[PDB]
Amino acid sequence: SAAGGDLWRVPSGWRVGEWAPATFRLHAGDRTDHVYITGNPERASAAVEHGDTHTVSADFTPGSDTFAVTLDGLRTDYRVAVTDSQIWLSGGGRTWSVQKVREEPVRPDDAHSGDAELVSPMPGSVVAVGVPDGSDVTAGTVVVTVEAMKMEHALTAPVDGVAKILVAVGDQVKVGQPLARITA
Amino acid sequence: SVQKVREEPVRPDDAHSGDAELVSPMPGSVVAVGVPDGSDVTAGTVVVTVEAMKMEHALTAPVDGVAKILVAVGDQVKVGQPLARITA
Amino acid sequence: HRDEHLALVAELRSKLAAAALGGPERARERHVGRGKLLPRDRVDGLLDPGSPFLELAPLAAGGMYDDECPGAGMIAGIGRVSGRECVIVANDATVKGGTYYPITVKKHLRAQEIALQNKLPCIYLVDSGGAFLPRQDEVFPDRDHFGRIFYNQATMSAQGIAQIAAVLGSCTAGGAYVPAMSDEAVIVRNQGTIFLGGPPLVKAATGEVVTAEELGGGDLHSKTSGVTDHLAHDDRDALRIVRNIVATLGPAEPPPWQVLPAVDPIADQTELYDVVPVDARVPYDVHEVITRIVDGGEFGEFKAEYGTTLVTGFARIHGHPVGIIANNGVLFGESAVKGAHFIELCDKRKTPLLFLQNISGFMVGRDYEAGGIAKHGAKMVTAVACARVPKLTVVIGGSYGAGNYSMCGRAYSPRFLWMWPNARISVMGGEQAASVLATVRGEMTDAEAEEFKAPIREQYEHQGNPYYSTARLWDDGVIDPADTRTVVGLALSVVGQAPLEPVSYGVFRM
Amino acid sequence: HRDEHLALVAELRSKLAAAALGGPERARERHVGRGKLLPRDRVDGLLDPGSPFLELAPLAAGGMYDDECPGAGMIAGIGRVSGRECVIVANDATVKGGTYYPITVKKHLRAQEIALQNKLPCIYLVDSGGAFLPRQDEVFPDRDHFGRIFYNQATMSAQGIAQIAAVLGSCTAGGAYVPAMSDEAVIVRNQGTIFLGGPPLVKAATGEVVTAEELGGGDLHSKTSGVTDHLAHDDRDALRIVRNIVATLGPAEPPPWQVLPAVDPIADQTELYDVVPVDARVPYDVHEVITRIVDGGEFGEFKAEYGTTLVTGFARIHGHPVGIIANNGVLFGESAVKGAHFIELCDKRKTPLLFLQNISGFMVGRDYEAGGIAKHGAKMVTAVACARVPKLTVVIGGSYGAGNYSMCGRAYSPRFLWMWPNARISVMGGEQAASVLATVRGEMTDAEAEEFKAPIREQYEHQGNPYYSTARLWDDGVIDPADTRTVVGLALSVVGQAPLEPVSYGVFRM
Amino acid sequence: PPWQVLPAVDPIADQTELYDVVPVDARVPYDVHEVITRIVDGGEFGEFKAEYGTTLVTGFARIHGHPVGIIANNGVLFGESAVKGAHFIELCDKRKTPLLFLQNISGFMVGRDYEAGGIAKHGAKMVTAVACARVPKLTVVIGGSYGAGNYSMCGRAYSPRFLWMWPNARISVMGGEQAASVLATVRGEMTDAEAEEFKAPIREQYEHQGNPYYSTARLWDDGVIDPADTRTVVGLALSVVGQAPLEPVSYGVFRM
Ligand SMILES: *C(=O)CCCC[C@@H]1SC[C@@H]2NC(=O)N[C@@H]21
Ligand SMILES: *C(=O)CCCC[C@@H]1SC[C@@H]2NC(=O)N[C@@H]21
Ligand SMILES: *C(=O)CCCC[C@@H]1SC[C@@H]2NC(=O)N[C@@H]21
């Protein structure tokens, strides 16, 4: 409705070949799934991930508090309210909210994503070590302090983990020199 | 209900307004005549077919009336030559 | 005529579905197994939700290269990203590792030509193994070979047409300039690799052994070399970053012309299957096409009673004004004079031109040459070549010889050109060629004449076929006839985004 | 190195002499026996007395089409007519009746591109039997196929670049637009003929029998149709009339830079044979070339101590200022940064650029990619593509891969590009290709290694050869090295005749 | 305005949180992202080259719906930081996006390997980009503003459309401790009680002349502002500077 018939704004998914389903990833309760909708609000089909394929018709009125869905021929009239992030629906004797959620990353993290490395921001010398080598620390913990140009660069552990310290007080250090590694 | 209607034309159309003259779209030759000369015809009836440039131009009567045929099969025809005339 | 059109559109849609898959299934499995999005899912994931996507030449290189290179190994087209229409060019890494074949270069250059002419931001999703070395002389060195891609990036960047790259896989040799020449480059960590010379060359030249991650991995370029501007965790994070970049470009220009509210056409567009013969030898009235594609069926014909083998008039399509020029028979001198006058009107009124080609050629004979049909044709060609308004061309039937030139064929730079599946394009029609060559060889028996004509008909049918045309990028796609209104409607919104030049004509041979 | 250059130049001059004859001697005899001038005598008869003539691609289509199409059936080049440099395009009616082969189209379009870029009047001496129908799909319909000739005529005419035709023989089908699209057209009485459809088509379509003089002879067009503007008694009268037309165009624009009196070079230019190795594997100092081609030997080198594998500096050639950019080894990042800065200086000083290519490529290895050599190369490519001054390129040695792009190869639209006879051009050098592919194939016996490498070497030697290049219009000609100074000196006077655009660059990847 | 203005979005933080995250003592390092994410609309900040030249932070945001390219010091300037800044300014110039400079700059990295690396040439490229940029420029001095770092970050000589100081800022050809240390190094060896007596007048000079009220008294800036008003002041200024049309893009020769 908001597209106002402007072809580039209408969510038709038009293609020269097979049209692309309008795709929503939705979270409600303990269920997160895609809904794929093809067609137009007057006559559409919707398929749900881990679910079935249903006929859909959707009767949206701008600024209305009510919205109607005919699902496999069963018309239900919902009270609807929407925030930046949640859709609240009530109808058919039940009430719920649904969140639109981001896609999962196609590549999951390696456990290295829990690890971090501290590097000297400046050339200078290590003036204090705040943590014993190979010890558990929290992301609030100052691990190594470098002095350069009369500035104390106190470097804070970015993660909770086992901190291993690579330098001793009085060591000269270069830019980007690893001073500690902190591991999950 | 009230309808807003378009203004009436200031001249009535002359009796010829229902008549049509069918002219050859191309130079070529007549390959069929579809209706007997002087018959009644109805719109969309094929009246004359001209072959030109190795294509067949079948010309329909656009209106019902007496169809008069002005050419015979095998006649060569120029562009815009009247092949038939339909009289309301 | 409906069943013949349905059979042709079924063949079209089958070919489109086959090309859309990309490479062999084992290549798709190896691509996804490394945690990548498939190239078409990369494109779809870049678009705004439910955006249309006007794919450029999906059947490029079809029937070429033993069909080993579906879509020429590339996905290209226009889609809405962050509220702007952008040209997206994505290497299909599943087709031969994204190797550039000669048609892959041609398709990339055509996508950049569309972006330059319409002022569209360019997004390059880069994942290519380099040039197809057995045909390197067709991939390199000429003016419209691979080196021209970067010439296009630089000069478009000079005009402020944003050039954005995301490096999603390999990027080697001259291809390393696709990221490095872009205004803003994204690279995926532990996937994207950029180098002017890769591990095999480093080994052959220096004896050093390196992996493609040590030589030019994403960490190296994002932290140390500065060749890249954003480090993405994965393909989805890269597409998200590209969307955020495009959100900084600001809006497109408003059209030069006034756009009204779109009015629905008076007919279901599959009625076009009823009115257009597949056999080009069967005449029909092209008004039956026009009144079905235009808004509300409203069509104001110019010079309706004069030069009647050419139909010219003003309409709207999706609220955009359009001047339609459509063939309705052989071109006469009167028809070309009519067309030139109409184009001058459209130029002054700033109205886009739509050319519906179904042209056998000009009228032949001594009285027509004496009448100066050649100079009336030249006046129409001058008007077409010099017209400053956007031109769109749909080839709905024949497109032969000098009639192709008068009707704004590919040489005249229409912003887009598409073929219907029944179209044919050739220096002359196949039956005309067979007839003229038979007349030159002289008297023959009917069987001797048929045996002489059959090879000529076969040549012109094979070369003039619309899939032969589209495989070579002579057009931007074969389209379903019933989609014509939508394709033009999408294009009319694109072509309004460039400002008009002033009116300027060559000398009309008066 | 002298004897190797002498052997290569002797081969060049033998090929040029063979191509200059045009068609077979029986065809030349039939041409002259009808009282015509030979096409090359038509061109020579058009020029001012003793004018030089800078022929475009005289060995086009060499080794193609079974060598049945010498010069691609066309003579094209720049000569002085009535005190102005004009682009002359003449159909060689002795070669296959002047049929347009695909390279004939490409050569015609290149001549029009030279005329557009340098604002040169175009003279078309028309005498052509039409398209080569067996390859009509390479002659028609694409953007750079035969229809583009008329688009060029129209748009050049819109810019006031005079388009002049003389119809000296047949002119058929779409070729009828060459005269009809001209601003002013001459036709020779009783042999020039113009028609959109010839006697064979008139017979096949209508059964009427006509001669080519009855249908569209010179009397008909000059008295009745008005397709032509002057009736010439013979070829020499036609050339006289064309000279009178050109005398009405007024003068060329003065150069945008200051031209000083030319100072002689300090050496005989055949000394270039002594200093340049034919074998591209042999290093030499390119200053030995530069100091020999420039006026007085004066060369002001810029950043002489930095990036020393690229030589950049200011000189004069025939009094015109030039910024010379010349390869002197492998390109480093420092070299590309140097080149980009020098190009910015030339752009602001309005000084035309001369590129002397002998480039293997960029320096390879992990420390160079980490140093961002691709980013520095991209800065040089941006400067080359965006430079507003005229660019000239001479390929004096290798021209391989991305080094071709950094050095203003054909994709970057240098106003002219020429090859020396020892040059090579390919996506990589033949030895590099053979080495990299052998390294990928792995360990093999030397007798097996040579058997594997020989086909690769043969491919890159065959495709990279400068006659293979020039046959396809990848360059504007192979030139004798000792002619380099003259060729550049002539071109510098041509390229000054167009006004400069304003300075504008794409985003430099700093 | 020549750019697109969107509906303004509130910042994610109370602006007096700026008092927590910025040290008054310029010798104490802090991450300038703590400032940026508090002043921009919705906290949204698209950083450009986040992993490279990390002592300069550059990125796109909105302030009161106006687009801004923020350029902020985050340490000493390196050559990498200056080429980053120049590239980002070229992007903002083509995108017609106004530039906001947040100065806290001691200067460029010193030493033989940096001069050999051409740090002066990279600084010159950033200075060229700043001087030639055709978009409006706004400058807030949030900390130190010393020497050639002032010039590289669009100080008063570069005609920022407005320039303001925070009350903790300092501005002089050197910092006071740099001047005192360099002059004591030229004095050579001296007793600590003699070194402090030598340094005290130099510190006093650079503290007196570098103070923000000494600056504003002489119109070297358009005002000392409360840090918590920075978002409002820039927002007001962003509505002003959109009222002039842009000149075309044009740069001097970049010393590549
Ligand atoms: C039989 O094929 C004769 C040709 C018929 C088609 C025509 S004639 C007129 C048009 N001009 C041309 O060159 N071909 C077209
Ligand atoms: C032997 O041929 C090893 C290959 C040498 C190729 C050289 S290396 C450096 C340049 N870069 C390139 O691509 N070719 C050149
Ligand atoms: C201590 O008093 C000396 C401080 C000044 C030197 C440092 S070096 C790096 C910064 N750049 C500059 O000019 N001064 C700062």
**Who's near D164: CB < 8 A, 6+ residues apart?**
D121, D122, D123, D124, D182, D183, D184, D185, D186, D242, D245, D246
Contact at 8 Å (CB) between D141 and D98? no
Q: Is the dihedral of CA D398, D404, D406, D411 positive or negative?
A: positive
Burial C300-336 (b: 16+ CB within 10 A, else e): eebbeeebbbbbbbbbbbbbbbbbbbbbbbbbbbbbb
C-contacting residues in B 17-56 (Cβ below 8 Å): 25-26, 53-56
Burial D451-470 (b: 16+ CB within 10 A, else e): eebeebeebbeebbbbbbbb
Residue A121 to residue E54: CA distance in whole angstroms: 9
Question: Any chain A CB within 8 A of the CB of E75?
Answer: yes
**Helices C148-158 & D373-386 angle (0-180, nearest 10):** 70
Residue C205 to residue C199: CA distance in whole angstroms: 10
C141: cis peptide before it, omega within 30°?
yes
Residue C45 to residue C234: CA distance in whole angstroms: 13
| D236 closest CA partner among D68, D36, D81, D428 | D36
Count of beta carbons in the 10 Å neighbourhood of residue C100: 30
The structure tokens listed for C296 are 């509300």
| D391 closest CA partner among D294, D488, D475 | D488
Coil, strand or helix at C57? coil
**Who's near D184: CB < 8 A, 6+ residues apart?**
D162, D163, D164, D165, D229, D230, D245
Q: Which residue type is seen at D493?
A: S
Residue B63 to residue B66: CA distance in whole angstroms: 10
Query: What secondary structure letter does DSSP report for E77?
Result: B
The structure tokens listed for C9 are 């559109």
- Could you give phi then psi for residue C440, rounded to 5 degrees? -70, -40
Pairing status of strand D184-188 against strand D163-172: parallel
DSSP secondary structure string, A46-88?
A: EEETTS-EEEEEEE--TT-SEEEEEETTEEEEEEEEE-SSEEE
Q: Which residue type is seen at C31?
A: H
Pairing status of strand C84-91 against strand C122-128: parallel
Q: Which residues of E touch C (CB under 8 A)?
A: 3-4, 46, 48-53, 60, 67, 80, 83-84, 91, 94-97
List the chains bordering chain A where 3 or more Cβ pairs fall under 8 Å: C, E
Which residue is listed with tokens 């990390």? E54
Q: Which helix (H) or strand (E) holds C420?
A: none
B-contacting residues in C 421-450 (Cβ below 8 Å): 431, 435
Pairing status of strand A142-148 against strand A161-165: unpaired
Coil, strand or helix at A3? coil
Coil, strand or helix at D409? coil
Query: What secondary structure letter does DSSP report for A39?
Result: E
Residue C167 to residue C251: CA distance in whole angstroms: 26
The structure tokens listed for C41 are 């899912």
| C291 closest CA partner among C256, C258, C326 | C326
DSSP secondary structure string, C22-44?
A: -S-HHHHHHHHHTTPPPHHHHHH
Cα–ligand 3 centroid distance for E147 (angstroms): 10
Q: What is each CA distance from A153 to A149, C276, C294, E56, in whole angstroms?
A: 10, 78, 70, 16
Pairing status of strand A161-165 against strand D74-81: unpaired
The structure tokens listed for D260 are 């000083």
| Physical contact, E and B (3 or more Cβ pairs within 8 A) | no
Q: How many residues are there in chain C?
A: 510
CA D165 to chain centre: 22
CA D226 to chain centre: 35
User: Which ligand is the nearest neighbour of the Cα of C426?
Assistant: 1
Contact at 8 Å (CB) between C319 and C263? yes
Q: What is each CA distance from E226 to E33, E35, E232, E233, in whole angstroms?
A: 19, 14, 10, 10
The structure tokens listed for D222 are 């000059």
Q: How many residues are there in chain B?
A: 88
Query: What secondary structure letter does DSSP report for A20?
Result: P
Q: Is C483 exposed, middle or buried (0-12, 13-18, 19+ CB in 10 A)?
A: buried
Which residue is listed with tokens 């779809």? C44
Burial D280-292 (b: 16+ CB within 10 A, else e): beeeeebbebbbb
Geometric angle at alpha carbon D480, from D478 and D486, rounded to 5°: 105
Q: How many CA atoms lie within 13 A of B81 on its CB side?
A: 17
**Who's near C194: CB < 8 A, 6+ residues apart?**
C167, C171, C172, C176, C179, C180, C187, C216, C221, C227, C228, D369, D374
Q: What is each CA distance from D347 to A84, B77, D251, E194, in whole angstroms?
A: 52, 68, 26, 59
Give chain D's radius of gyration (CA, Å).
25
Q: What is each CA distance from D7 to C15, D2, D10, D12, in whole angstroms?
A: 55, 9, 5, 9
Resolution (A): 2.0
Q: How many CA atoms lie within 13 A of D500 on its CB side?
A: 21
Q: How many residues are there in chain E?
A: 256
Which residue is listed with tokens 């007496």? B66
CA D310 to chain centre: 25
Residue C119 to residue B82: CA distance in whole angstroms: 53
Q: Which residue type is seen at A91?
A: G
Contact at 8 Å (CB) between D150 and D203? no
For the Cβ of D439 lying below 6 angstroms from any atom of ligand 2, the answer is: no
**Who's near B43: CB < 8 A, 6+ residues apart?**
B60, B61, B62, B63, B64
Number of H helices, E strands in chain D: 20, 15
DSSP secondary structure string, E166-198?
A: -TT-EEESS-HHHHHHHHHHHH-S--HHHHHHH
Q: Which residue type is seen at D151?
A: Y
Contact at 8 Å (CB) between B46 and B22? no
The structure tokens listed for D381 are 């490519």
Query: What strands lie across the sheet with A135-137, from one edge to the other?
Result: A116-119, A178-183, A161-165, A135-137
Q: Take atom 10 of ligand 2 and give the residue whose Cα is closest.
A: D361
Q: How many residues are there in chain D?
A: 510
Residue D393 to residue C417: CA distance in whole angstroms: 35
Contact at 8 Å (CB) between C156 and C116? yes
Q: How many CA atoms lie within 13 A of C264 on its CB side?
A: 4
The structure tokens listed for D91 are 């159909």
Contact at 8 Å (CB) between D144 and D103? no
Burial C7-25 (b: 16+ CB within 10 A, else e): ebbeebeebbeebbebbee
Residue E46 to residue C245: CA distance in whole angstroms: 8
| D326 closest CA partner among D293, D361, D287 | D287
CA D403 to chain centre: 20
Contact at 8 Å (CB) between C344 and C383? yes
Q: Is the dihedral of CA C149, C152, C158, C163 positive or negative?
A: negative
> Can you give the three-state secondary structure of C164-217, one letter per residue?
EEEEEEEEEHHHHHHHHHCCEEEEECCCCEEECCCHHHHHHHHCCCCCHHHHHE
- Could you give phi then psi for residue C367, rounded to 5 degrees? -70, -25
Which residue is listed with tokens 């026996």? D33
Geometric angle at alpha carbon D471, from D466 and D475, rounded to 5°: 60
Question: What are the E-state strand segments in D23-148?
Answer: 53-55, 74-81, 84-91, 122-128
**Who's near E253: CB < 8 A, 6+ residues apart?**
D341, D344, D345, D348, E128
Contact flag E254-D345 (C-beta cutoff 8 Å): no
Residue C476 to residue C392: CA distance in whole angstroms: 11
Contact at 8 Å (CB) between E154 and E139? yes
Contacts of A42 in chain C (CB under 8 A): none
Residue C428 to residue D262: CA distance in whole angstroms: 54
Question: Any chain A CB within 8 A of the CB of E106?
Answer: yes
Q: Is D261 exposed, middle or buried (0-12, 13-18, 19+ CB in 10 A)?
A: exposed
Contact at 8 Å (CB) between A99 and A31? no
Residue C84 to residue C247: CA distance in whole angstroms: 8
**Who's near D117: CB < 8 A, 6+ residues apart?**
D413, D415, D495, D498
Strand partners, D237: none
Q: Which residue type is seen at C434?
A: A
Residue C85 to residue C472: CA distance in whole angstroms: 25
List the chains bordering chain D where 3 or more Cβ pairs fall under 8 Å: B, C, E
Residue C365 to residue D75: CA distance in whole angstroms: 32
Choose which residue among D425, D432, D436 to substitute to test ligand 2 binding: the one with the highest number of ligand atoms within 8 A of its C-beta: D432
- Could you give phi then psi for residue E22, rounded to 5 degrees? -105, 115
Residue C163 to residue E90: CA distance in whole angstroms: 13
Question: What are the E-state strand segments in B6-81?
Answer: 20-23, 28-33, 40-41, 46-52, 55-60, 65-69, 76-77
Contact at 8 Å (CB) between D112 and D152? yes
**Who's near C433: CB < 8 A, 6+ residues apart?**
C426, C456, C459, C460, D133
Residue C305 to residue B72: CA distance in whole angstroms: 27
**Who's near A105: CB < 8 A, 6+ residues apart?**
C233, C234, C236, C237
Strand partners, D186: D166, D230
Which residue is listed with tokens 């740099």? E178
**Who's near C493: CB < 8 A, 6+ residues apart?**
A6, A7, A8, C85, C318, C320
Question: What are the E-state strand segments in E89-227?
Answer: 99-105, 137-146, 162-165, 170-172
The structure tokens listed for E76 are 């000493």
Helices within D71-146 (DSSP H only): 102-118, 136-139
| C464 closest CA partner among C379, C381, C398, C375 | C398
| E80 closest CA partner among E59, E57, E111, E99 | E57
Distance from CA of E233 to the nearest CA of D (A): 31
Contact at 8 Å (CB) between C87 and C54? no
Distance from CA of C38 to the nearest CA of A (A): 10
For the Cβ of D204 lying below 6 angstroms from any atom of ligand 1, the answer is: yes
The structure tokens listed for D278 are 């034919």
Contacts of A107 in chain C (CB under 8 A): 35-36, 233-235
Count of beta carbons in the 10 Å neighbourhood of residue E226: 14
Q: Is the dihedral of CA C499, C502, C505, C506 positive or negative?
A: negative
Coil, strand or helix at D182? coil
Contact flag E48-C184 (C-beta cutoff 8 Å): yes
The structure tokens listed for E199 are 């340094």
Distance from CA of D205 to the nearest CA of B (A): 6
Q: Is A48 exposed, middle or buried (0-12, 13-18, 19+ CB in 10 A)?
A: middle
| C335 closest CA partner among C406, C236, C414, C253 | C406
Contacts of B78 in chain D (CB under 8 A): none
